[PDB]
Design a protein around this nucleic acid. Sequence first.
RNA 1: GAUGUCGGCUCAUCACAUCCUGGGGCUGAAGUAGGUCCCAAGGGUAUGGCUGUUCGCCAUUUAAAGUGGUACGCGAGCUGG
RNA 2: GUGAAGAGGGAAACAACCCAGACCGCCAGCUAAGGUCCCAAAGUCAUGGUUAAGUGGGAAACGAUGUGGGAAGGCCCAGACAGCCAGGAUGUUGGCUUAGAAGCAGCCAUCAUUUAAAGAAAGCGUAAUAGCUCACUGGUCGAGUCGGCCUGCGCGGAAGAU
Lengths: 176, 141, 164, 136, 38, 94, 70
Amino acid sequence: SRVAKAPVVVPAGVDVKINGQVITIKGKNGELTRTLNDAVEVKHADNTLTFGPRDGYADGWAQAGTARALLNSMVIGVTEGFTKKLQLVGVGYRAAVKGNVINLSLGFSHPVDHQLPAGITAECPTQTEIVLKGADKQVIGQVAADLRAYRRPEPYKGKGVRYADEVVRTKEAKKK
Amino acid sequence: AKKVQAYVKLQVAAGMANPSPPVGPALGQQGVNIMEFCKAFNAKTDSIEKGLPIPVVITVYADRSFTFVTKTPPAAVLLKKAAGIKSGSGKPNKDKVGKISRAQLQEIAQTKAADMTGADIEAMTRSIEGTARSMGLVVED
Amino acid sequence: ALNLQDKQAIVAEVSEVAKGALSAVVADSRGVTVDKMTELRKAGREAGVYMRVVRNTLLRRAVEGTPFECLKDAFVGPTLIAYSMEHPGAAARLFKEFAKANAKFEVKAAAFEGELIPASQIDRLATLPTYEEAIARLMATMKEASAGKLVRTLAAVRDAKEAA
Amino acid sequence: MLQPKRTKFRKMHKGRNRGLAQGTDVSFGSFGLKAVGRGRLTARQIEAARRAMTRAVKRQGKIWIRVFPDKPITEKPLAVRMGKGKGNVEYWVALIQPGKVLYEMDGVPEELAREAFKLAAAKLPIKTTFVTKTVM
Amino acid sequence: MKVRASVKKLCRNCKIVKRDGVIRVICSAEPKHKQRQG
Amino acid sequence: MFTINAEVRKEQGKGASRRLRAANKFPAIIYGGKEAPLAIELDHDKVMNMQAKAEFYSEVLTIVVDGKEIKVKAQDVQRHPYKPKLQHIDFVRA
Amino acid sequence: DLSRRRGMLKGQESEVTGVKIHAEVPLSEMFGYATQLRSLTKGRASYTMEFLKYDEAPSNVAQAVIEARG
RNA sequence: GAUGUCGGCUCAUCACAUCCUGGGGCUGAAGUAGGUCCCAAGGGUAUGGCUGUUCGCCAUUUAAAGUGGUACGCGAGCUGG
RNA sequence: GUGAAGAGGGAAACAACCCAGACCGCCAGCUAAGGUCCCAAAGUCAUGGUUAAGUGGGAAACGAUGUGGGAAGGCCCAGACAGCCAGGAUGUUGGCUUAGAAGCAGCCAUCAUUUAAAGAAAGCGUAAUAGCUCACUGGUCGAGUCGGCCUGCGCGGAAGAU
């Protein structure tokens, strides 16, 4: 029911600079946190999400539901920010955190690098747990997933880079 | 899943009870400790009359000590034991076993009248009515 | 309209029980598990103490629209009706027993006659003499707590700030 | 499978499967399969669907067939110069046109019966649709 | 995995999406069920 | 119960009848008794809904047509013979 | 595994630190059997067998071959 | 009143229902191997034995010794078995 | 019927298709089928409905929370839909079957209890009950929603040699 036609009214929780179509959310924690949602038939007034007449379709007030998700995700990035627990079972390998750059491994001899984009940073309490910490739910989950593409969980007994996967499959030797 | 657990079920041999051995190898594989042996082996054991394999009930909670408790056999079991019946039907009421006096049920209600649910002995007797018919046994006059 | 056939039938019965409770308690579910209801549930319907947990969305709108021994406001959330028609102890002996797996404040409040009994009062509703002398001790008590305690207590915490 | 005991003639024309149907409605059992489409149906196919549905459904009801395949239809042997006397009779054809009921069955609850004709519809040439009893 | 002309649900809680063009099953149980392109 | 309402037919035979059957009507007749047979339409969606209520076929029906009202008990019906439709229905006077 | 060979179980008992399983088994199948078992368990398990008696065969090939050989 | 009819040699050229090589899904896929499968037309893709065969059987080789079209690529180029 | 023995227009081309039946000349008008942006003569015409595929502009069984139309219909603030929190019982762990009874191993019978309430059980899942999810049940949520049927229109199914 609710979000398709009453778009949560995305409150101004300190604080929203709205040009018009270019949006900057201006708060402390990942400061001046910004997104350009353009005029995708998404009209705004103060911190509200308002429709117009899309292409052929004309929808039903749908991407005003979306625009409300993407601005609030953006606002909540600047207020609360958040825990990307990414983690390894994999016989440790590498997992040097160093500021903007992460050195991981997959048994592969070479520095695996990956340079974190500016907007986020990461650290490791122990090699097997990595917290990427910071700002925007979109770039941050992308860097997490691109790190788990340094290798999936192995599906039989689970070796790999684990982000949200607290459900890794537990297959077995020589059939059951 | 859902966290720590209430009322875990185990169903267990009618051995020496103070000594372990017909219970011992079923105990052995699940890591019934020397400590687990003390709550179950030392105790809730002999000076109770063996004749039925005894229910043993697990409460899970742990600083490395989760516990195993001995009590009375269950209503289905007591029905089979108490009535002096053969063994239950193949097809309830479309095949048949026995007849049973309602008064025997009532004494059956009375022994099982501990935690068995039915807020009334009359209600209590009826659940075991519905057990007796399920086994084929008509509660009968 | 209105779902099930018990739900349109029940309105005279819930309304009947909701008059009946000459002591009543509004109390909380969520996180009970089976046991805390069960262990009273069996014995109660023999023993003369009642505990039901009943539809709080219907009870909260129903109570507004029908006085059920006054009351209404603080039913909100997941809600049990504990009740004794009897002198107050059976209802109140039950609650610290419900306190082992939750707390004292899962009752939000209770009612006796027309006086509001919260947990502060509840120990006192829970202290009850021999029956013929009790109902007199209970009538002098509720008549005391109604207007005398307010006019003293509203002054006294402001006197605590003035007088240190 | 279904085949007649001795017909008056034993080869027959192309024939004309033009028009609707007089052999319509579910009439015998409680519910059935209506043909709803246009075309020609073999004996072997009737067989393949009735077996399939009795095994799907598991008996203690039974199915009633409202189609018989009468009609001879020919093969010409491969690599034969065209003409040379009409072909030889090969297999038997039942003629379907809209509304022809194919099967009725009894006793079987609707949802289970819904599945049970769903199989035969995958087994034939034509676009069947479920029908139930009704008077008058 | 297969690529099919008939796509439909295996384990009950399997799921159906037309992504890009062609309606794919996807699943959270046992991922035999990944049956695309119907 | 069973209450329908109707208009009296101003056309006849197949060319008429299809041009109605297309237009969500269907034709019908009330025959029976002394009073000459009366040829009538009903609206297909309306009187379809009571094909499956079986009291459509056993019980006396209230037939209001033109606003003048007859009372009728049903007779055999023609249905077309793969899409749910009553193709045309007969009715008998009480 | 035991089921696979056309073996059929008598029954199963717990044992002091592990489990004991007893069964009736076809004979002409077992000539990878110990290595297979070793494979399943991480080399840990063991077995013994003797011949109980004789019971029906359904496999074609034994009867089929008997004229080439003699 | 002219479509010179099979095989080989010389030269090819494309199609992809891909032999291999490259990416990727699944797997009764642990590694290994593999089975299957969506993708993909770039390049590569055997010699020798026998017989007029195309093929075939076979030795031996490779990464592979693909399938199919092109008067079943073809004689105003060759052989004519 | 035409072609054969009939031209011209149209369907790119095109005997027999659709239109039409040429006596001769015109720097004249209307029209048929067929058409009206431009290659090319005529409407980028008014009106309203629809389709997001380049369908239109090649083809099926079949498959689908793809879009508009449609009556009938259940639900519908005394609280829905379902999201979030929370219970998911009781005898019981049903009898029989037993390779082994576990709701979920075959079958039978579907029975009962306190219930605001949970099937002697729908799916996962395992060794024998254990393990896990589930409608159901209670809160918060604070409204439209769900299910069926008829139905116009599009979708994949759809891979071959200059």
